[PDB]
Design a protein around this nucleic acid. Structure first.
Lengths: 161, 161, 161, 161, 161, 161, 161
DNA sequence: TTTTTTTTT
DNA sequence: TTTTTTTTT
DNA sequence: TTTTTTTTT
DNA sequence: TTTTTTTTT
DNA sequence: TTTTTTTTT
DNA sequence: TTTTTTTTT
DNA sequence: TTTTTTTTT
DNA sequence: TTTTTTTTT
DNA sequence: TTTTTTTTT
C-alpha cells in the first residue's frame, strides 16, 4: 500500500517537499528477484498564493537519483550543486522541457537556497521556485536522505531473515 | 501634530516596532529655548496570536536613551548588549516592574535576536517577546536610528536659518 | 509638486537610474498623521539602442523597499545580493511576471554588476539589462540611498520645528 | 579554399566545437592591404539526442572576439568569465535574440563548465547547452586559441618574406 | 532665538557638556551672504562638589574647531589626540592662559578619558577636570558631532529651496 | 541668494578651498520640477605670494562631479585618485586646456597631497598648486562632502513636507 | 606590399593602436642578407573629439624597441614601466621633443593605464593621451606582441625551407 | 568659472 | 507609556 | 605502427 | 613618423 | 502531556 | 509525474 | 551564421 | 509603474 | 566665553 509521509518546508514564496520512491522489482522465473525501475527521492516545489497558502496546482517535480542523493549528503557548509534533468529524456519529446535544481549556500552560512527552474519550450513557460533551508532543516534532509538511500537502491532487500 | 511612521519587523512569535519620541522644550522667559524632557527611540514589542496576526493589546514598551541608541549603532556584527530599565524609577512604585532589552547576534551571523523581558512583581507576570532581525533589517535600524539621534537630542534646533 | 532628480549611470548595453518615491500619509481624524503607502527607492533599467543612445520605451522598473535598501548600503566589497519581486503580488495577476535584481561584485573588485531580469509568462518575454557600476558610482548610491532611507521611511517627519 | 579542422569536445548532454574564422582584407587602391571584417574564434554548441549521438540541426553559435579570446587564455584555474552577445546588434532586429557564454570552474578544480544560453524573444525559445571541459581540454583550447589569436587579428600578414 | 540642548555626561569628579555654536554671517551689499565668525563645538567642563552635585561656577570652556571636530570623529578605538588652545591668542593677553584638551583611550578599551587642563599664569591657577566616556557615550558624540559639523561650517545654507 | 561658506586649508605654497554648487532646476509646464545643470563640489587652488599671503588673482578651479565626490569619500588611508578635466569639453576650444587633480597619500600616513595641475596650450602656461591635507582636514572634507552629496544631486528636494 | 591590421583600443578620452613595423634588410654582395633598420612595435595615440569620435589629425607615435617589447610582455599584474624617447636623438634637433610612455596598473587590478606624454619645446606644446586597458585587452597585446617579437627582430628569416 | 552626454514625467 | 538625575543662558 | 567515436561545409 | 649606437659574414 | 500550520494521493 | 542507459543470476 | 563601432596609409 | 501583509494613536 | 589668520563674490 501507498505511503505519504513527506518532509516538507514551507517558506515565504514557495514550499518544498521530499519523499522516497521505492524501486520496483521483477520476480525472475529463476525464482530470485531483479531490481527493475530505480528508486529516487522525489522533490516537489509549489508557490505560495495569497498569504501563507500554497497553490498545489502549480507544483513542479524533480527526482533525485541515488548518485544525486549521494552528492547532497556529502555537501559541505560552503558547497553548492546543480543538477539538470530532461523529464522526457530519450523519448520523442526530449529537449522540450528542461529542469535545473540548484543548492547554493546563503551568504550568512545559515543554510542554503534550494531552487527548481523549469523551462518549457512547448508551452512557452519559465517557472522558478526558490526555498530557503536552514542548517537544521538541511540536517533533517541529509539524515533522512541518508536513511533512505539504501532503500531507494533496494539494498534493504539484503537482510538476514 | 502627531506623526506615526514606525519601522516595524514582523516575525514568527512577535512583532517589533521602533519610532522616535522628540524632546520637549520649555520657552525661557529670557527668550531662548531650553530642552526639557529628553527624546528617546521607543521600542514596542507584541506577540503573534493565531497565524500571522498580532495581539496589540499585549504590547510592552522600552525607551532607548540617546546613549543606549549610541550603543546600538556602534555594535559590531559579533557584539551583544543588554539594557535594564525600571519604568517607575525614583517614583513610589520603583522596584516593582523590571524590563531588560537584549540584542544578541545569532550563531550564523545572519543578524540578531532582540528580546524584551518584563517581570512585574505587582501583577505576578513574566513576559518575554523575542524577534529575529536580519543584517538588512538591523542596517535599517542603525541608519534610521543614526539619522534620528541628533533629533532626539534636540540638536536639529541648531540650524542656520 | 513632482521632483525629477535621478542619479543615473549610462553604460555600454544599458542605463540604470535611481530615485526615491516618498511615502504617502493619511491625515487622521484624531488630528495626527499616519503613514500609508511606504516609500521605495525606484530603479529603472533600459537598453542602449544604436550607439550611445537608449530606448526609454523598453524600460523595466524595480522598487527597493527600506529593508532592501538597508541590504545594499551594508554590502561589503565582496558581497552580493539578489531580490525577487512579483509586481502583481497578492493581486489576481500574481505569478505571471517575475523580476529579479542582482548585485554581484566583478572579479577585479573594481565594482559590481547590477542586473534586472524580467520574465513575463503572459507576454512570453524574457528581458535582462545589466549595468557595470564602479566603486565610485556605488559609493554615490550608498551615500544617496543612506541619505534617502529615513525619508522613504517617513522619519523626516519627526523634526523639531 | 575553405578549411574545416575544428577542435571538438563531446560530452553527456552536448558537444562543443571551436575554430578560427580569419579576417577579410580589402586591397587598397594605394596598393597595400587593409583589414576589413575582423577574425573571430567561432564556438558551436549542439545537444546530444539519443545515446552518444548529437543533433547538428539544433546548433547555436558564438563568435569570440580577439579581446574575448584574450580573456579566455588569461584565465586562472579559479577564474570565471561571462560574455553577452546580440547577433543582430545595431541592425533592425536588435534586442530580439540574446546570447550569453559562461566559463565557470567546477568545484573540484578539475576544469570548467562552458555553457551557451540563447534567449530568442521572436520565436519564444530558451536554449541552454552546457559542456564540461577538463584541465587538459582547456589547455588545448588556451594553446590553440593563443596560436590563433595573431591570425584572427591578421598579424600573420606581418611576415619577413 | 537661543537654543540650549547640550549633550552632557556626568561622572565621579567632573561633568562634561558639548553643544554647537553656529557660525555668524554677514549680509553682503552685493546681496549674498558671507560667513563671518566660524562655528565651533563648545565643550564645558565643571567639577563635582559634594556628592552627585556639580559646581557650575567653576566651569572651564574649550571650543573645538571644524578641523578638531574632524579629528575626534575620525579617531580609532586605540587612538588619542591632544589640542592646545590660547583663549587670548593674538590679543594683548596672549600667553597668559593655556588650555589643553586630551582624549586618551582607557586601558580596557571601554572608552576614553577626556580631560581639560587650564593653566593661568595671571591668577596662578592650575585646573584639571577629567571625565570618563564610555564607547556608547563617545558614539553619541561622534554621531552628534558628525551631524553638527556641516552646520558649524555653515554648509547647511547650501540647500535646495 | 548666494552663499559663501567655503572650507579652506592654507598651507606653505598654496591654499585650497571647497564649496558646493547646487544644481539648477527647470520648472516643467507639466507642473513638476526637472533637474537641469548638475551640482558639483568646486575646488579652488591659489598660490602663496610673499609670506602667509596668497594671490587670489592666480586661482585655478576644478569641479568635482557627484561621482568624483563618491570616489573621494570612499578612499582608504592608503588609496590615491586622479581626475582629468577639460573645461571646454565638447565646445570649440576643447583640447586647449587640461586639468588634472590628484589625491595621493603621503609616506607617513599623516594625510594626503592634493594637487591641481593646469596645462594651457593657448597661453603656453603650466601651473601646479599642491596642498598638504592632514587626516583631520580630510576627515572634515569627507564628512562635509558626504553631507553635500545628496544636495548637489538634488535629492534634498525629495523631502516630506 | 603594405599591411594595415592594427590592434586598437577605443576609450573615453583617447584611442590606442599598435602594429609591428618589420625590419629592413640589405642584400649583401657576399650573397646573404644583413638586417639593417630594426623593427619596432608602433604605438599610436589620438584624442576623442566630440562624442565617440576621434581626431586622427592629432595623433602621436611611440616606437617600442625589441627590448621595450620584452619589458611589456614580462610585466606582472602589479608592475609598471616608463620609457623615454627622443624622436630626433643624435640628430641636429635632439632635446627639442620629449616623449614618455607609461604603463601603470590601476588600483582595482582590473588592468592598466597606458599614457603617452609629448613635450615639444619648439612648438611649446604639451600633449597627454591616456587609455585604460583591461586585463583582457592587455592579454591580447602581450600575446600579439610576443608573436610579433621574433618578426621585428627578423628571426622569422631563420626558417627551414 | 565650472569636463559633457545619454531618458521621461 | 516611557529607567532618573546632575548645570546655566 | 599509431586507443576510437560523436557534426557539418 | 619612428629614441641611436656598438661587430661580422 | 506534547509549540501549530501550510499540499495531495 | 518522475533525466536514460550500459551486465547477469 | 557570426555582438558593432571609432582612424589612416 | 511600483512585491504585500501584520498594530495603534 | 570661545586659540587666529590667510581669498573673493
Amino acid at each position: 500500500g501507498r505511503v505519504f509521509a513527506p518532509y516538507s518546508v514551507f517558506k515565504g514564496k514557495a514550499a518544498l517537499s521530499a519523499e522516497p520512491r521505492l524501486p520496483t522489482f521483477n520476480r525472475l522465473d529463476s525464482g530470485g528477484v531483479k531490481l527493475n525501475r530505480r528508486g529516487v527521492i522525489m522533490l516537489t516545489f509549489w508557490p505560495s498564493v495569497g498569504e501563507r497558502k500554497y497553490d498545489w496546482e502549480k507544483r513542479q517535480l524533480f527526482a533525485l537519483s541515488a548518485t544525486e542523493v549521494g552528492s547532497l549528503i556529502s555537501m559541505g557548509t560552503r558547497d553548492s550543486s546543480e543538477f539538470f534533468h530532461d523529464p522526457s529524456m530519450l523519448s520523442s519529446n526530449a529537449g522540450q522541457v528542461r529542469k535545473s535544481l540548484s543548492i547554493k549556500p546563503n551568504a550568512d552560512g545559515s543554510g542554503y537556497f534550494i531552487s527548481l527552474s523549469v523551462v518549457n519550450n512547448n508551452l512557452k513557460t519559465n517557472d522558478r521556485f526558490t526555498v530557503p533551508v536552514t542548517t537544521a532543516e538541511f540536517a533533517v534532509m541529509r539524515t533522512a536522505f541518508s536513511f533512505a538511500l539504501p532503500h531507494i537502491m533496494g539494498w534493504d532487500r539484503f537482510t538476514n531473515r
